[PDB]
Every structure is written in structure tokens, then in C-alpha cells.
Design an enzyme around this catalytic site. Structure first.
Site, PDB file in Angstrom:
ATOM      1  N   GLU A 100     -15.377  -2.441   0.822  1.00  0.00           N
ATOM      2  CA  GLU A 100     -15.257  -1.163   0.145  1.00  0.00           C
ATOM      3  C   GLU A 100     -14.686  -0.123   1.094  1.00  0.00           C
ATOM      4  O   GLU A 100     -14.837  -0.226   2.315  1.00  0.00           O
ATOM      5  CB  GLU A 100     -16.618  -0.635  -0.349  1.00  0.00           C
ATOM      6  N   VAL A 101     -14.039   0.887   0.523  1.00  0.00           N
ATOM      7  CA  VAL A 101     -13.656   2.083   1.261  1.00  0.00           C
ATOM      8  C   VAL A 101     -14.350   3.272   0.618  1.00  0.00           C
ATOM      9  O   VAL A 101     -14.382   3.396  -0.612  1.00  0.00           O
ATOM     10  CB  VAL A 101     -12.133   2.317   1.326  1.00  0.00           C
ATOM     11  N   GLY A 161     -12.936  -4.176  -3.231  1.00  0.00           N
ATOM     12  CA  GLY A 161     -12.239  -5.417  -3.469  1.00  0.00           C
ATOM     13  C   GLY A 161     -12.843  -6.530  -2.650  1.00  0.00           C
ATOM     14  O   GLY A 161     -13.961  -6.421  -2.141  1.00  0.00           O
ATOM     15  N   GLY A 188     -12.509   2.690  -3.147  1.00  0.00           N
ATOM     16  CA  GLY A 188     -11.902   1.387  -3.270  1.00  0.00           C
ATOM     17  C   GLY A 188     -12.939   0.306  -3.084  1.00  0.00           C
ATOM     18  O   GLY A 188     -13.860   0.438  -2.269  1.00  0.00           O
ATOM     19  N   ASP A 218       1.373  -7.338   6.408  1.00  0.00           N
ATOM     20  CA  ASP A 218       0.915  -7.177   5.029  1.00  0.00           C
ATOM     21  C   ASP A 218       1.362  -5.830   4.472  1.00  0.00           C
ATOM     22  O   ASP A 218       0.595  -5.098   3.841  1.00  0.00           O
ATOM     23  CB  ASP A 218      -0.594  -7.387   4.909  1.00  0.00           C
TER      24      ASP A 218
HETATM   25  C1  LIG Z   1      -5.213   0.837   2.692  1.00  0.00           C
HETATM   26  O1  LIG Z   1      -6.377   0.612   3.493  1.00  0.00           O
HETATM   27  C2  LIG Z   1      -7.189   1.661   3.836  1.00  0.00           C
HETATM   28  C3  LIG Z   1      -7.134   2.886   3.182  1.00  0.00           C
HETATM   29  C4  LIG Z   1      -7.996   3.914   3.567  1.00  0.00           C
HETATM   30  C5  LIG Z   1      -7.939   5.221   2.870  1.00  0.00           C
HETATM   31  C6  LIG Z   1      -7.664   6.361   3.622  1.00  0.00           C
HETATM   32  N1  LIG Z   1      -7.574   7.567   3.052  1.00  0.00           N
HETATM   33  C7  LIG Z   1      -7.753   7.687   1.739  1.00  0.00           C
HETATM   34  C8  LIG Z   1      -8.042   6.602   0.912  1.00  0.00           C
HETATM   35  C9  LIG Z   1      -8.197   6.899  -0.555  1.00  0.00           C
HETATM   36  C10 LIG Z   1      -8.765   8.101  -0.975  1.00  0.00           C
HETATM   37  C11 LIG Z   1      -8.881   8.410  -2.329  1.00  0.00           C
HETATM   38  C12 LIG Z   1      -8.409   7.527  -3.297  1.00  0.00           C
HETATM   39  C13 LIG Z   1      -8.523   7.820  -4.752  1.00  0.00           C
HETATM   40  C14 LIG Z   1      -9.992   8.055  -5.092  1.00  0.00           C
HETATM   41  C15 LIG Z   1     -10.186   9.353  -5.859  1.00  0.00           C
HETATM   42  N2  LIG Z   1      -9.271   9.411  -7.011  1.00  0.00           N
HETATM   43  C16 LIG Z   1      -9.519   8.275  -7.911  1.00  0.00           C
HETATM   44  C17 LIG Z   1      -7.851   9.404  -6.618  1.00  0.00           C
HETATM   45  C18 LIG Z   1      -7.664   9.017  -5.152  1.00  0.00           C
HETATM   46  C19 LIG Z   1      -7.821   6.339  -2.891  1.00  0.00           C
HETATM   47  C20 LIG Z   1      -7.700   6.038  -1.538  1.00  0.00           C
HETATM   48  C21 LIG Z   1      -8.132   5.324   1.492  1.00  0.00           C
HETATM   49  C22 LIG Z   1      -8.456   4.075   0.691  1.00  0.00           C
HETATM   50  C23 LIG Z   1      -8.884   3.706   4.611  1.00  0.00           C
HETATM   51  C24 LIG Z   1      -8.919   2.471   5.261  1.00  0.00           C
HETATM   52  O2  LIG Z   1      -9.789   2.205   6.293  1.00  0.00           O
HETATM   53  C25 LIG Z   1     -10.762   3.190   6.645  1.00  0.00           C
HETATM   54  C26 LIG Z   1      -8.086   1.452   4.853  1.00  0.00           C
HETATM   55  O3  LIG Z   1      -8.111   0.241   5.486  1.00  0.00           O
HETATM   56  C27 LIG Z   1      -7.450   0.137   6.731  1.00  0.00           C
END
Ligand SMILES: COc1cc(-c2cncc(-c3ccc(C4CCN(C)CC4)cc3)c2C)cc(OC)c1OC
EC number: 2.7.11.30
Length: 288
Positions: A21-22, A17, A15, A136
């Protein structure tokens, strides 16, 4: 005396934005999620860190905290939040390509209601917690777990009771018309309930009944632009008092009929008329 392994291998960006980034990372051979904060969003790191330093939330439907890290650099400060990693990604992502059956739909929404009620409730005594409002809640801030339950993420705007504002598309009428009673903690719970009702609508659209399903759409997709302005939202939600449409086909299905009633009771203009998260849970356990 002991080695403190702090190296995290950043493997893929999942991610990016305005928040930063994540990344999927690896610590000691296990996946973690690493959120690297932009300068513009540093206060979200501070608020979530302050909250977790006050109460170590541990709940199956709240994204699991691992660490908050601040590292000095030559001319800046680097801020990371490290959490459990959910490889299926966000509910927003998941709903784009996946349809649901009755069991999976209910399991998703009940798990979200469970995490939200856990946030909202004050627990007294040792191993208790202050009441917390999220501020949020939306489908991008919910992650899907392999067991079919979800967890709520991003406490960067959260408030506790014993520049960043919410996403405009999900703002309750009293936020948009600035009548929210800012000195009453229950007001913030009621804002979360409005947003929960919108998420419930997003999910229910994707549940199949009688061979029919709606395409994924975000709330108010038919009445505001992308990146709607505060005014765009206020006109829809406050002035015209519009609410998301309930398709006819839901009324042939007992689950979607019950979910439509539940949504409506999250969307009353009068915040004090909205259901509580605890009442939502009870209603969901009695469906099907
Ligand atoms: C909402 O916010 C936060 C989210 C997360 C977070 C935790 N587990 C997994 C994710 C993730 C993994 C994988 C995908 C995609 C990429 C691969 N493919 C394209 C399909 C799947 C998307 C998302 C995230 C983004 C962590 C955060 O903080 C450390 C966040 O902020 C608080």
C-alpha cells in the site's frame, strides 16, 4: 541530547496492490508518501534501499527519497519507503480525466526524459553517480507535480553500472523474445527507451489539436487483453512486430508530428538503433 521524532501519521491510503500500500502521511506537519511493502515484494525495498545507500539521487524529476525504515514486529518485519508526496497522483491517473495543450504536453514529456537521462548517465568524481536503468518505466510509475513537471518513481527493479520482472505490457521485444544481452548495461537503457516511447504515446494521445483528442488508453489496448500474458505480448511485439497506432489527426499538428517521429525512434526492433535519453531531450527542446 536530541529527540528523534519518527512518528508518521498515516492519513489516507492512496494506493493498494500486490506491492502493498501507499499512504499519504504526515511528519512534522508536512505531507510524505509511505509505501508499506507486502511480503511478496520485500526485494524491491531492499534494492531501492541498497541503491540509495550507494548514491543519494537528488533530481527534480526523480521522486525525492526521505527514508527507508525496517521495524521488527513479533512475527514479521515491516518495511516502509518514505518519499516526497505529490498530491496530483500518477501520470496514469492524471491522463484519465485531463487533456493537455502543446506547452503542457511538452513539459510533461521533457521532464520525464530529463529524469530518465539523469538515471542513465554515469557522473564521475565526487558527488557523481553510477549509471542506472529503471526497468519498470510506465505511466503508473510517474508522478505529476504542481508545477507541471513529472518525476519518475519506483527503483525497486533498478540496476546500477559503473522474482520481480517489468510490467509485461511495457516490455521491449528483446525481453519478450529473450534475446536481450543481459551482460551489457546498455541493453537495460534501451529497454527503458522502448518503455519511454510507449509513455510518450500515452501522453500525446491526450494533447488536443484542432478540437480533437483521443481517449486515454494504455499501450496495446486494441491487441492484447487486460493483464496480458507474456505470450500475448510476444506475439504482438515480436512475431507480428506491431506498434501503437498514430492517428491521422496528429499529422495536422506540428508538435504531434514531431512526437510521432520521436516515438518511432524509441520502438525500433534493433535495440541499438533506438535514440538515447540525451538525444530525446535535445529533440524535445527543439519542438515548438
Ligand atoms: C509509483 O510509486 C510510488 C508512488 C508514491 C506516491 C507519491 N506521491 C503521491 C502519490 C499519490 C498521491 C495521491 C493519489 C491519489 C489519491 C487521492 N485522489 C484519489 C487523487 C490522487 C495517488 C498517488 C503516490 C502513490 C510513493 C511511493 O513510495 C513512497 C511509490 O513507490 C516508490
Amino acid at each position: 541530547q536530541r529527540t528523534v521524532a519518527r512518528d508518521i501519521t498515516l492519513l489516507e491510503c492512496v494506493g493498494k496492490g500486490r506491492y502493498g500500500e501507499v499512504w499519504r502521511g504526515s511528519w512534522q506537519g508536512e505531507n510524505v508518501a509511505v509505501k508499506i511493502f507486502s511480503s511478496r515484494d520485500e526485494k524491491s525495498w531492499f534494492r531501492e534501499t541498497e541503491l540509495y545507500n550507494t548514491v543519494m539521487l537528488r533530481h527534480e524529476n526523480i521522486l525525492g527519497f526521505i527514508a527507508s525504515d525496517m521495524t521488527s514486529r513479533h512475527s514479521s518485519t515491516q518495511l516502509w519507503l518514505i518519499t516526497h508526496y505529490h498530491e496530483m497522483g500518477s501520470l496514469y491517473d492524471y491522463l484519465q480525466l485531463t487533456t493537455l495543450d502543446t506547452v503542457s504536453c511538452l513539459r510533461i514529456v521533457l521532464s520525464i526524459a530529463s529524469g530518465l537521462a539523469h538515471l542513465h548517465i554515469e557522473i564521475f568524481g565526487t558527488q557523481g553517480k553510477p549509471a542506472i536503468a529503471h526497468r519498470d518505466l510506465k505511466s503508473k510509475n510517474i508522478l505529476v507535480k504542481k508545477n507541471g513537471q513529472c518525476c519518475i518513481a519506483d527503483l525497486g527493479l533498478a540496476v546500477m553500472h559503473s522474482p520481480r520482472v517489468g510490467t509485461k505490457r511495457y516490455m521491449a521485444p528483446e525481453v519478450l523474445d529473450e534475446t536481450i544481452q543481459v551482460d551489457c548495461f546498455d541493453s537495460y537503457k534501451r529497454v527503458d527507451i522502448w518503455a519511454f516511447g510507449l509513455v510518450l504515446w500515452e501522453v500525446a494521445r491526450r494533447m488536443v489539436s484542432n478540437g480533437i483528442v483521443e481517449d486515454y488508453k494504455p499501450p496495446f489496448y486494441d491487441v492484447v487483453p487486460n493483464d496480458p500474458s507474456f505470450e500475448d505480448m510476444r506475439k504482438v511485439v515480436c512475431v507480428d512486430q506491431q506498434r501503437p497506432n498514430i492517428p491521422n489527426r496528429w499529422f495536422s499538428d506540428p508538435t504531434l508530428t514531431s512526437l510521432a517521429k520521436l516515438m518511432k525512434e524509441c520502438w525500433y526492433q534493433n535495440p541499438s538503433a533506438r535514440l538515447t535519453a540525451l538525444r530525446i531531450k535535445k529533440t524535445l527542446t527543439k519542438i515548438d
